[PDB]
Design an enzyme around this catalytic site. Structure first.
Site, PDB file in Angstrom:
ATOM      1  N   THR A  80     -40.765 -20.155  -7.876  1.00 26.71           N
ATOM      2  CA  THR A  80     -42.078 -20.369  -8.499  1.00 26.71           C
ATOM      3  C   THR A  80     -42.530 -19.109  -9.242  1.00 26.71           C
ATOM      4  O   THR A  80     -43.295 -19.196 -10.211  1.00 26.71           O
ATOM      5  CB  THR A  80     -43.159 -20.780  -7.487  1.00 26.71           C
ATOM      6  OG1 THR A  80     -43.208 -19.823  -6.433  1.00 26.71           O
ATOM      7  CG2 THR A  80     -42.879 -22.176  -6.900  1.00 26.71           C
TER       8      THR A  80
ATOM      9  N   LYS B  96     -30.733 -13.969  -3.544  1.00 27.11           N
ATOM     10  CA  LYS B  96     -31.553 -13.650  -4.717  1.00 27.11           C
ATOM     11  C   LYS B  96     -30.917 -12.549  -5.586  1.00 27.11           C
ATOM     12  O   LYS B  96     -31.294 -12.371  -6.746  1.00 27.11           O
ATOM     13  CB  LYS B  96     -32.974 -13.270  -4.284  1.00 27.11           C
ATOM     14  CG  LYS B  96     -33.826 -14.474  -3.828  1.00 27.11           C
ATOM     15  CD  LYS B  96     -35.070 -14.055  -3.025  1.00 27.11           C
ATOM     16  CE  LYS B  96     -35.921 -15.243  -2.511  1.00 27.11           C
ATOM     17  NZ  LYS B  96     -36.607 -16.062  -3.612  1.00 27.11           N
TER      18      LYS B  96
ATOM     19  N   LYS C 206     -44.491 -18.324 -13.116  1.00 32.61           N
ATOM     20  CA  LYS C 206     -45.579 -17.369 -13.330  1.00 32.61           C
ATOM     21  C   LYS C 206     -45.294 -16.446 -14.521  1.00 32.61           C
ATOM     22  O   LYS C 206     -46.171 -16.215 -15.364  1.00 32.61           O
ATOM     23  CB  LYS C 206     -45.831 -16.541 -12.053  1.00 32.61           C
ATOM     24  CG  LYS C 206     -46.111 -17.379 -10.803  1.00 32.61           C
ATOM     25  CD  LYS C 206     -46.259 -16.506  -9.551  1.00 32.61           C
ATOM     26  CE  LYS C 206     -46.174 -17.360  -8.285  1.00 32.61           C
ATOM     27  NZ  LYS C 206     -46.114 -16.507  -7.042  1.00 32.61           N
TER      28      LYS C 206
ATOM     29  N   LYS D  36     -39.889 -10.554  -5.575  1.00 29.53           N
ATOM     30  CA  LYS D  36     -39.612 -11.710  -4.701  1.00 29.53           C
ATOM     31  C   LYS D  36     -39.103 -11.111  -3.396  1.00 29.53           C
ATOM     32  O   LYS D  36     -38.715  -9.945  -3.361  1.00 29.53           O
ATOM     33  CB  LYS D  36     -38.541 -12.650  -5.291  1.00 29.53           C
ATOM     34  CG  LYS D  36     -37.223 -11.959  -5.714  1.00 29.53           C
ATOM     35  CD  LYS D  36     -36.293 -12.899  -6.515  1.00 29.53           C
ATOM     36  CE  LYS D  36     -36.891 -13.286  -7.879  1.00 29.53           C
ATOM     37  NZ  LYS D  36     -36.952 -14.770  -8.067  1.00 29.53           N
ATOM     38  N   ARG D  37     -39.079 -11.904  -2.331  1.00 27.69           N
ATOM     39  CA  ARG D  37     -38.555 -11.403  -1.060  1.00 27.69           C
ATOM     40  C   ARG D  37     -37.090 -10.946  -1.220  1.00 27.69           C
ATOM     41  O   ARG D  37     -36.335 -11.515  -2.012  1.00 27.69           O
ATOM     42  CB  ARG D  37     -38.716 -12.456   0.045  1.00 27.69           C
ATOM     43  CG  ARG D  37     -40.183 -12.722   0.435  1.00 27.69           C
ATOM     44  CD  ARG D  37     -40.779 -11.560   1.234  1.00 27.69           C
ATOM     45  NE  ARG D  37     -40.082 -11.384   2.515  1.00 27.69           N
ATOM     46  CZ  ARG D  37     -40.550 -11.776   3.702  1.00 27.69           C
ATOM     47  NH1 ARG D  37     -41.740 -12.353   3.807  1.00 27.69           N
ATOM     48  NH2 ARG D  37     -39.823 -11.567   4.800  1.00 27.69           N
TER      49      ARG D  37
ATOM     50  N   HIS E  22     -37.344 -27.402   1.449  1.00 30.51           N
ATOM     51  CA  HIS E  22     -37.464 -26.204   0.612  1.00 30.51           C
ATOM     52  C   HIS E  22     -36.210 -25.317   0.577  1.00 30.51           C
ATOM     53  O   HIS E  22     -36.248 -24.250  -0.023  1.00 30.51           O
ATOM     54  CB  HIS E  22     -38.670 -25.342   1.032  1.00 30.51           C
ATOM     55  CG  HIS E  22     -39.989 -26.033   0.910  1.00 30.51           C
ATOM     56  ND1 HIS E  22     -40.765 -25.963  -0.225  1.00 30.51           N
ATOM     57  CD2 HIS E  22     -40.671 -26.811   1.784  1.00 30.51           C
ATOM     58  CE1 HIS E  22     -41.868 -26.667  -0.049  1.00 30.51           C
ATOM     59  NE2 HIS E  22     -41.832 -27.196   1.163  1.00 30.51           N
TER      60      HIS E  22
HETATM   61  O1  LIG Z   1     -40.692 -24.780  -2.639  1.00 34.13           O
HETATM   62  C1  LIG Z   1     -41.312 -23.487  -2.643  1.00 34.13           C
HETATM   63  C2  LIG Z   1     -40.255 -22.390  -2.485  1.00 34.13           C
HETATM   64  O2  LIG Z   1     -39.752 -22.461  -1.156  1.00 34.13           O
HETATM   65  C3  LIG Z   1     -38.868 -21.370  -0.873  1.00 34.13           C
HETATM   66  N1  LIG Z   1     -38.591 -21.534   0.527  1.00 34.13           N
HETATM   67  C4  LIG Z   1     -39.050 -20.706   1.458  1.00 34.13           C
HETATM   68  S1  LIG Z   1     -39.952 -19.268   1.173  1.00 34.13           S
HETATM   69  N2  LIG Z   1     -38.670 -21.146   2.636  1.00 34.13           N
HETATM   70  N3  LIG Z   1     -38.901 -20.630   3.707  1.00 34.13           N
HETATM   71  C5  LIG Z   1     -38.412 -21.295   4.647  1.00 34.13           C
HETATM   72  C6  LIG Z   1     -38.595 -20.828   6.021  1.00 34.13           C
HETATM   73  C7  LIG Z   1     -39.685 -20.026   6.368  1.00 34.13           C
HETATM   74  C8  LIG Z   1     -39.844 -19.610   7.689  1.00 34.13           C
HETATM   75  C9  LIG Z   1     -38.907 -20.002   8.648  1.00 34.13           C
HETATM   76  C10 LIG Z   1     -37.829 -20.810   8.275  1.00 34.13           C
HETATM   77 CL1  LIG Z   1     -36.610 -21.350   9.465  1.00 34.13          CL
HETATM   78  C11 LIG Z   1     -37.673 -21.231   6.963  1.00 34.13           C
HETATM   79  C12 LIG Z   1     -37.574 -21.557  -1.653  1.00 34.13           C
HETATM   80  O3  LIG Z   1     -36.641 -20.521  -1.292  1.00 34.13           O
HETATM   81  C13 LIG Z   1     -37.940 -21.511  -3.141  1.00 34.13           C
HETATM   82  O4  LIG Z   1     -36.781 -21.793  -3.942  1.00 34.13           O
HETATM   83  C14 LIG Z   1     -39.076 -22.494  -3.472  1.00 34.13           C
HETATM   84  O5  LIG Z   1     -39.568 -22.236  -4.797  1.00 34.13           O
END
Ligand SMILES: OC[C@H]1O[C@@H](NC(=S)N/N=C/c2cccc(Cl)c2)[C@H](O)[C@@H](O)[C@@H]1O
Ligand SMILES: OC[C@H]1O[C@@H](NC(=S)N/N=C/c2cccc(Cl)c2)[C@H](O)[C@@H](O)[C@@H]1O
Ligand SMILES: OC[C@H]1O[C@@H](NC(=S)N/N=C/c2cccc(Cl)c2)[C@H](O)[C@@H](O)[C@@H]1O
Ligand SMILES: OC[C@H]1O[C@@H](NC(=S)N/N=C/c2cccc(Cl)c2)[C@H](O)[C@@H](O)[C@@H]1O
Lengths: 811, 811
Positions: B650, B548, B654, B542-543, B351
């Site tokens: 994502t 971003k 939406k 978004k976060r 991801h």
């Molecule tokens: O695939 C679904 C979405 O995934 C998101 N990844 C996220 S929230 N990862 N968190 C990773 C994470 C979370 C907690 C700890 C650690 Cl060490 C890593 C992508 O940024 C986004 O482009 C994509 O649309």
């Protein structure tokens, strides 16, 4: 099957079956193919609980409309046991549920065994609160029990290598169907901080806040459609609590630890900060709830007309300065009016005279935790001692003795003194106990205010302690005298007419035999132990304490073993000696006593020469549900505390009601039991209180007894030499040393009389007809010991309210 | 009221009303006189939940009888949001419940607002797991989600003085009606200990034990009567735990802390022991449950035919060595067979490509916590590197690059490398992302095993993200093309026929206006903020992350403000600029960005010359339930990450589905969205990935942009001098410094193109007809972005199972 268990009408049975199936499906998300016995228990619990709802809502609605005086029973312990059978009994649903489950192919008694005890107490004091709630509901009083919802109750006891091990009582693991969370009535409780003085009085500021979330449990009266409430508080951190981020969230546990665990000491005071926090937590939340309910009825003159607060020992004694705090600091009443209201509202029940059991809180603890309360306590003390000074001018030692503040290395607050000063009534729990309070520990206070001192002899509920646990006995009684006795236990006197009735004699003896058979089978199944059901069942069950003298029982057991070994081919009445009870985890001597009992069993139970003439069994994990099994099975009740040490006892009353004879000292309620039954129908032995006092004056010398009694000398030599611990010859040296040099409870002094009295018990048991006739005389005179009588006396003599036997309308 | 919300038949409405009243009485113990709105919510929740039971039992019964291949989706995050409306939608109960509650005198939408979000995730990855569960149920797959039941989910965000404050999300406070505890399936999880070698292999001994108690939550498919399960584990201490006595009971919290709180970092790795324990806890409990279910169908050859495990990122990567551990140590399979089974069972989804987001666990942590797993990982590594050595002889640098063990100051295990080695499939989450994986970070692995690498472009569920949150839009679409599109979103292409339809154009624009009015009213009521509903709603939610580029948005906002101040009497298209999102608690720069946004609002929103032409609002506490409100109301979607940094996104999808146009870079799924809609129907700007690479090669110099763009220079001078913080002139110096000297994400490099592109947006918005026609072209081509499409591709290309649209029988 049996009449006292109510009707099993076709409409009722059909309905119960429907609702049981509905709950299994919708509530439990199971079908009959995957359902476990625990699922079946829960389906039944939900089905029964549904029947409480209408009655609970309309009882509470009724109190709102009629606005009677409300009774608030404050306790840190409510030893409730199981709830399913009790609810069925009080709602007359037992036979209907029995039939409904039978038709579903289930055994209801098997389902009942799945329920966990609500073990929110240690022993007698906690169980008394529970019997009291049942009686208050049965007598139609507008009563509320208030306490703490401990996540962990009294520990489960396991015996490993003859030693007690403690295990966490995770009683909420599967969820508790007998509670309803009420998060809407959550209230803040304040801790620490400091006191600020303004132009308009004191203010308590910079406090830490813990939330108190209430859980309500219904308390059904016996077939009167009354359902009262027991409200228990759970500790919750506020959401901004400690708010790096992860640790702040994890540290919420620090606040929530307040309601985590029940302190497992009975009759022993440990001045720990967590316990103090528990005591204030229940008091602060409860008083806010009381005041809120009172305002929903400005002028606090009518407060004592609408509110009674009963303090179950000194544990909730902070109610007194907390009420003052609210009335003075928050409501802005003058001191003297606030005090008048407080005194008229509060009453205090004392449950012990042992000095180590009295709560004496170090001043430095109260200073940090509850700074405003300490100031209020100081003021109460000053004004009280000013009254003592005026009544007894020049008596400077009386002033030091009566002070709420105790001098010494660490300054302490005597909570019992606070309770007496701040209450309109102070009671002991049996006639001899109440007299001892007036003549000894509270003599100074009795001289100042004699009108405050009362007696309220303890009782037990005959719903749990007869109808529920001993349906066979309840039924044979009902056949002769009807059912009215269940809520009017004095009617049992009518049984005196049947003492020469051959049919009744046979039936009473038959019910006992059946109970013993059932218990002998319970032992084999759950504990793989084999007992002779023809033997005399000699039972001592209660918490392990030196004052209760399980050790004296041990000495008798060894005497019997030694006599058998001396004359193996002589006939003796066979006995099964059963001892059970938990020891407080930090009480070393009590732990040694358990080890001794099991060690004696190890020798006695495997000696081929003894055969089945003597068995010694330690009953593991003694608790309410176990009492309900063993008490109906008992022939002989051991109530053998040193005279002047057991305030009342209540186990004694349970055995009396259930057809056991009593061997006992003239201590606590035993005195009144013997008086009710006739001393000829009781096995009384040993020193009276006066004899103990005489012995103390000249000094107790255990050596004298050891020197004069050869049978006693032999036992001590066996203990010392390692006869009962061949691998660790010195294992019991602590016990021997205490008996010989440091015995506060004069075990040797009653030994000869006890053994002789036990011989007389054996003699009577050889004559089944006469044994049983004496039993009938005990059961017939047990009526005084109903907690219905006790509560009716509290109501009339302390709370100023009339009990009512009248039904509320049903549906 | 509206057609897509189902039927409101008299029988159904009557029944719902009956059951609602039953629950209020029996379940909640309330009547209508004392019931609070929360009580009404719960009565409704129980009423709706009752409808799931039969379908849930028979779905699970069906899988047992047919024994299909089961899919296990392992995730540390499931960002579920609210459950009540979603359940009504999927069961076609919405209109019936609306009518039933209306007749009871209640507003159902008001009741819906009472439910807490199940906030068991951070953002995109957690929400993806939730959309996936919905799609798997809708496609009739035998799927289970497995995760952790956190006591505390993502923190509630409060803004104080423009700064983020965190508050504990105590989401379980009132009890969760959407779970069923399953204590009967409690399983032991092992920690610490040591490895012993015997004649017959390794043994893991002297471990500490934590219990895993499962809670099941139903996942209903869309009107197909399928109800799948999400099983979440809760940590429980064993009863003999730490078993002076009081402390031992209190210390149970140490074990139970495992499931206490969700780690609030997204796209950032923190190597904390508690997090590692969480990762193993979910994996160990889940694998035991999987194996148990498989045996209830000896020979593990058929394991991969009956089991697929999907790893949602590397968080549950310990599944690989745990499966090996069980197969080798407990089942006694040879290594090579165990490995074959493991590889064929597991698949891994990546991801992110940010290096600081990759999990690299220190060896010393694994050594202490999971000694046996470290040994297995070493063995996996040795055998893998032996394969690399044979494929690329002499390439010693490839060996160091590909190793699962990383050398350096502290030795670490690269969990992504472990996942690739131990999985038969590895996928990225959008076409450009999957290509970047093959060309850059995993290039070496792609060269070794090209067949493992796949793409699965992300999607969103059109149940929650259209029918639920935007019923007005769903209805006008349904009027033209029917209802089939709700589970076959590609049918939206039929809307291309209506792009010149005057009625449709009017209806689409009307629905947007209504949504904006409703949201403008929500803002005033809950947050006392006043916005102009005629303005363009410019939204970035978004976060908060540097990648971003909320900061780039800020720069545009200030540009607009400065231009207005320069030419106050010139017409500009009015905008409401809304930014929202949580910052990870320890991410200082993200916290500063929030403070900047609010600081800009403070200046812009109170400048009389600006009037209502520009408003800047920070949306507090952005979460799933808030997204459901703001997304339907949006006109412009800001998707402005630096090219190559957002794996997919994502939120973008939406907004597309809900009638907003997109301003964005060619990053993540934006690329495929523009390709679907046509680049002419998208507002694309900025560097492509290739341009970013070119800039990195010669070196990024922010000063160059500052020197050449007078409008940019002005903004930086305003930030530095204290224009946006008059009391603390230096407040934003960290932000300025980063932009000028240390900007990883090249904010200045895209500034000119962004501003110009924003001018083009304003131009189109001046022409409502043409704005709306472009909107219709976006909605009509959003079909590819249904998670139904995504899941059908996982099913066919990775899991080896066929989706089914067929109904299961109802009652
Ligand atoms: O695939 C679904 C979405 O995934 C998101 N990844 C996220 S929230 N990862 N968190 C990773 C994470 C979370 C907690 C700890 C650690 Cl060490 C890593 C992508 O940024 C986004 O482009 C994509 O649309
Ligand atoms: O079943 C487990 C849960 O049950 C909940 N009870 C609910 S929802 N209704 N009760 C209704 C009810 C109805 C009559 C009598 C009683 Cl005594 C209760 C409790 O609030 C919760 O703390 C507990 O964990
Ligand atoms: O009135 C009911 C019964 O009360 C019992 N008292 C008990 S269990 N007190 N626990 C006191 C206690 C408990 C915890 C802490 C402390 Cl510091 C003291 C009496 O011993 C018994 O004769 C009587 O029948
Ligand atoms: O209401 C609060 C309590 O509810 C309990 N649920 C019970 S008794 N039945 N559920 C039945 C059910 C039925 C259908 C769907 C679902 Cl999703 C559940 C939970 O086990 C407990 O963790 C929770 O605290």
């Amino acid at each position: 099957q049996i009449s006292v268990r109510g009707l099993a009408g076709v409409e009722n049975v059909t309905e119960l079956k429907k609702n049981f199936n509905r709950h299994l499906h919708f509530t439990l998300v199971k079908d009959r193919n995957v359902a476990t016995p625990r699922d079946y228990y829960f389906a039944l619990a939900h089905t029964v609980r549904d029947h409480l709802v209408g009655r609970w809502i309309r009882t509470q609605q009724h109190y709102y409309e009629k606005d009677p005086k409300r009774i608030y029973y404050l306790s840190l312990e409510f030893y409730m046991g199981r709830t399913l059978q009790n609810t069925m009994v009080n709602l007359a649903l037992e036979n209907a549920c029995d039939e409904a489950t039978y038709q579903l192919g289930l055994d209801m008694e098997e389902l009942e065994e799945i329920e966990e005890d609500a073990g929110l107490g240690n022993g007698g004091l906690g169980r008394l609160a529970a019997c009291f709630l049942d009686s208050m509901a049965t007598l139609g009083l507008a009563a509320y029990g208030y306490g703490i919802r401990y996540e962990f109750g009294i520990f489960n006891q396991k015996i490993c290598g003859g030693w007690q091990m403690e295990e966490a009582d995770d009683w909420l693991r599967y969820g508790n169907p007998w509670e309803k969370a009420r998060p809407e009535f959550t209230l803040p409780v304040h801790f620490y901080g400091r006191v600020e003085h303004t132009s308009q009085g004191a203010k308590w500021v910079d406090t830490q806040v813990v939330l108190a979330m209430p859980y309500d449990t219904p308390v059904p009266g016996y077939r009167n459609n009354v359902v009262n409430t027991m409200r228990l508080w759970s500790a919750k951190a506020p959401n901004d609590f400690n708010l790096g981020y992860i640790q702040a969230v994890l540290d919420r546990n620090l606040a929530e630890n307040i309601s985590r665990v029940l302190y497992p000491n009975d009759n022993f005071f440990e001045g720990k900060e967590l316990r103090l926090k528990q005591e204030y937590f229940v008091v602060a939340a409860t008083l806010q709830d009381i005041i809120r309910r009172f305002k929903s009825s400005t002028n606090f003159d009518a407060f004592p007309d609408k509110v009674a607060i009963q303090l179950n020992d000194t544990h909730p004694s902070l109610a007194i300065p907390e009420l003052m705090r609210v009335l003075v600091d928050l409501e802005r009443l003058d001191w003297d009016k606030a005090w008048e209201v407080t005194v008229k509202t509060c009453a205090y029940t004392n449950h012990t005279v042992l000095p180590e059991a009295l709560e004496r809180w170090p001043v430095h603890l109260l200073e940090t935790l509850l700074p405003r309360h300490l100031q209020i306590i100081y003021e109460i003390n000053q004004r009280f001692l000013n009254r003592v000074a005026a009544a007894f001018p020049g008596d400077v030692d009386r002033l030091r003795r009566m002070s709420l503040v105790e001098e010494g290395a660490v300054k302490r607050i005597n909570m019992a003194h606070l309770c007496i000063a701040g209450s309109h009534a102070v009671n002991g729990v049996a006639r001899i106990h109440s007299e001892i309070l007036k003549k000894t520990i509270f003599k100074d206070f009795y001289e100042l205010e004699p009108h405050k001192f009362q007696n309220k002899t303890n009782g037990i509920t005959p719903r749990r302690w007869l109808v529920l646990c001993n349906p066979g006995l309840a039924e044979i009684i009902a056949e002769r005298i009807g059912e009215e006795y269940i809520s009017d236990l004095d009617q049992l006197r009518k049984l005196l007419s049947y003492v020469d009735d051959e049919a009744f004699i046979r039936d009473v003896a038959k019910v006992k035999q059946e109970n013993k058979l059932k218990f002998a089978a319970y032992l084999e199944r759950e504990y793989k132990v084999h007992i002779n059901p023809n033997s005399l069942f000699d039972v001592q069950v209660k918490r392990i304490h030196e004052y209760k003298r399980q050790l004296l029982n041990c000495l008798h057991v060894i005497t019997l073993y030694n006599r058998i070994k001396k004359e193996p081919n002589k006939f003796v009445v066979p006995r099964t000696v059963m001892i059970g009870g938990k020891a407080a985890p930090g009480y070393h001597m009590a732990k040694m006593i358990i080890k001794l009992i099991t060690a004696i069993g190890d020798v006695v139970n495997h000696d081929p020469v003894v055969g089945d003439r003597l068995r010694v069994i330690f009953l593991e994990n003694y608790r309410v549900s176990l009492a309900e099994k063993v008490i109906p099975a008992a022939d002989l009740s051991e109530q053998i505390s040193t005279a002047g040490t057991e305030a009342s006892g209540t186990g004694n009353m349970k055995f009396m009601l259930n057809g056991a004879l009593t061997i006992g000292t003239m201590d606590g309620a035993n005195v009144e039991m013997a008086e009710e039954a006739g001393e000829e129908n009781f096995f009384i032995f040993g020193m009276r209180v006066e004899d103990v006092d005489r012995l103390d004056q000249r000094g107790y010398n255990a050596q004298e007894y050891y020197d004069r009694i050869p049978e006693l000398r032999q036992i001590i030599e066996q203990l010392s030499s390692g006869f009962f611990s061949p691998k660790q010859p010195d294992l019991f040296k602590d016990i021997v040393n205490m008996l010989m040099h440091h015995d506060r409870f004069k075990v040797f002094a009653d030994y000869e009389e006890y053994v002789k009295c036990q011989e007389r018990v054996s003699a009577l048991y050889k004559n089944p007809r006469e044994w049983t006739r004496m039993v009938i005389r005990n059961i017939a005179t047990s009526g005084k010991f109903s907690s219905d009588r006790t509560i009716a006396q509290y109501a009339r003599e302390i709370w100023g309210v009339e009990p009512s036997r009248q039904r509320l309308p049903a549906p």
